[PDB]
Amino acid sequence: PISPIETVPVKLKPGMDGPKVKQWPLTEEKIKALVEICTEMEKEGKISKIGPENPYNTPVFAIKKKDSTKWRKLVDFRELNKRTQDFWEVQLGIPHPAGLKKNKSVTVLDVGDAYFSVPLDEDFRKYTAFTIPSINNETPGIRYQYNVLPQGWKGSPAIFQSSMTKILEPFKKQNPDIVIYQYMDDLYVGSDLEIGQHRTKIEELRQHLLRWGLTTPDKKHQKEPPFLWMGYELHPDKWTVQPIVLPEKDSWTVNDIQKLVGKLNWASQIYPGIKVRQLSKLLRGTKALTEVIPLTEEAELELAENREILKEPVHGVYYDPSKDLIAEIQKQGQGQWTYQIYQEPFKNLKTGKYARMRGAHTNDVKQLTEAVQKITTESIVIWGKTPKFKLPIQKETWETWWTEYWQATWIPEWEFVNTPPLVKLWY
Amino acid sequence: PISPIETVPVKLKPGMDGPKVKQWPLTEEKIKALVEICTEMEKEGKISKIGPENPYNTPVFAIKKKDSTKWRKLVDFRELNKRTQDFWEVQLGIPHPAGLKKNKSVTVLDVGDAYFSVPLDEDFRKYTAFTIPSINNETPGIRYQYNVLPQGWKGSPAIFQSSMTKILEPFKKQNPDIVIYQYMDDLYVGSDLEIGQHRTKIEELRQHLLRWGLTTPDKKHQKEPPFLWMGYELHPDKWTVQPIVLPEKDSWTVNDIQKLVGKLNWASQIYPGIKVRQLSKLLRGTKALTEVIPLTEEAELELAENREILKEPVHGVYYDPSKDLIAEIQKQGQGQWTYQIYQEPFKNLKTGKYARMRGAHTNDVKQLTEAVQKITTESIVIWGKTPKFKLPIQKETWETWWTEYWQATWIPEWEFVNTPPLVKLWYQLEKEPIVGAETFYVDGAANRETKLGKAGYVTNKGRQKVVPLTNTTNQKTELQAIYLALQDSGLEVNIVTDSQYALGIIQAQPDKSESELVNQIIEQLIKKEKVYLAWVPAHKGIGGNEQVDKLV
């Protein structure tokens, strides 16, 4: 009942103006997808065509979700978000369930659909301007602007929150043990139930939303068993700590102890438990690398004490909502990729290792871009928000492919990094 | 005539009003020049004589451009253009000829007074107010206001295009085959219908525009192949660049050299082989607009060879959505690479080069991928797809490379091209140490102040050496030392440093570097049969290097 015609006065933050981000160019494949997608949207009246009194423009890509047929237009409202929604991380913000990271299972459902009902502030519409490009500019971009809550723009959830709470009301009644956290376009439903039990609580809700006003595609695809894995289920309860493990050997050469010395040294901004002064000196002479050095020591009481202190998780690390999370990833080989989420250098909040294959059909990008997605999700569960990536790939290369295997409706923020040298020895 | 087109609404930047710049009286020869003109405009509805309180004014100059009888009025909008809201910018993107499909026959029109035929947001005319001087008497507030896209304003270009686009639309629908390209004042129209039919459709579109008030100053089509467009010459199976005349002075200043790289890079779209690293290298911190800069043997030679490549023409062909897109790369030098993309052999669509940014050191495999990437991004723009890459690198050199390389990467499938010089790994480091091979504990330091330093080694066999170094860096020495080692070692060796810095510069396994010293090492590495590099704690944890740190 906002005085304005169902428009919830939306407003960019003070002394801030609309987004003017460039549209990267896409393959003809995608241009075609996007024009088919948008021509409909125009007809369903979700978007309308704009003119030249609109300097504004946010990017847009075409991706393929859980499916492998129909395409999907994914707008990159990152800039528009930073420019509005912070004045909407407050006003109409949505709190975060500390237990969700706790529950046994968590399933994510995509409700980005509801939005297209609720009309957008007629005054703000102008900022959702996106352009569909031409090949070789042999014509000017097709220009459209939203009239409804666009999906992707952190405005929608916020604005729409009311309507949600309401819908979910019944379900939260019957089932009161189950948590439901929304984040942008997804619902994160978690339970203590057993496998198929949980998958029933979900499917009920699924049917609940579905019978009461809103479409709801993915948790999964179908009942057809082909022995796949793209069905999206989650389990906060296990994912935990890190393999900051030292090697277990039989014939220790110098090179072998020499390293052990600096790997254990490295952990001197982390675990206090060791300074290998004693183990270091066990090689003051200038012996040979290939050579062999024995076990009796004044110093081994260290590989002793240390081999265990490195197993007790360090405390003194505290999340901080004000600060931005920063995730790093190292390519480790054999389709293996480690990672750490921190806020303040060497005070790691979470450190894991997404792996896929070793040499199948997968490839370096795809995995990276898959590990990201993983980490991003884990992140949204734990602290209810996406981190900022320092990705080990060349800017231009990522910009050409990430679209490819990309699946989520959100885009984290990223930057590209150097040759972490010995930092690669984290696993 | 004028136009029934809807107007695009405009407005001034939030909290800003119209310009109020007064007129600088002048030659009554011009005050009489303008008056004539303005009358011919108002009689055409373009301009509109206004009243008293239209505060706004914008200077109107009148220049009878040299060697021409008529005069052309000129209004200076700078002020309004600062008060006008920003627009969706006029496609800055220019298509690349290599991406233009075909069309047996093309016509180019010339929507000139075009902008003067498109309506101007009513409520926005006020600010177009301008005045022409009263000969000093009767105080003429001879005031005229614009009712169209003033040939100078900010939103003029964009709004024209929009307005034009909306226009074509109808015509476009009755001839889904005729493709038309609009840009500035041109309108390129092309058909697959013999000159007979085709001309019908041009004459046709012609009047169509005219009913929209758009008058095309061409009884026939003033088209004159080749087309002199955006620095290119357009032909019926060939496209190339316009005359690229490369200067030759006894003295070159920064802006001299710049304009040169420019003409070079542009020429590189089709003149295979154009190099430019050395030249541009000259322009460094070269923020001295006019400061003579002596060329280098390097620069002159490149410049030379460039003159050599230019002396004989080269055409580029158009495009076939039907055939394939293939791009090949070949190495031509100092970390310089050149390429060309084609659908059929010995003709090209376009060509191009590639060198590394001021980035410390590189490597052949890394660099070639870097080229492939550039070609890929470019191909998606021009053609909207990725070409088939034929590359001079054995697939095993690249896997052993990408695989062990610490950084993500994905190059579509290519195809080996025996045409040497091949791209190979000049060497590899033993991942695992070397038994029997001597072990050198290498080191080098310098007083961060006195600018002095020394490099030297210590071995398992008891051999040692220290070499004096002056004017160096705690850095150039850490490498110095590694290098000293590789020098005295034998066919096989195990070096060990306290420099993650040095460690990592070699670790990357470069083959080319700006740093002569590294190149120095890169040399030696070649010779070694087996080389193993290791990094113990730089300082503190003082293991075996505990003894090279002191006497170095």
Ligand SMILES: Cc1cc(C#N)cc(C)c1Oc1nc(Nc2ccc(C#N)cc2)nc(N)c1Br
């Ligand atoms: C002629 C032209 C120029 C510019 C711009 N700028 C832009 C476009 C979209 C054009 O149409 C096309 N012209 C040609 N070749 C061509 C044919 C004849 C002549 C002549 N005479 C010149 C070029 N091939 C196409 N696929 C297209 Br589409």
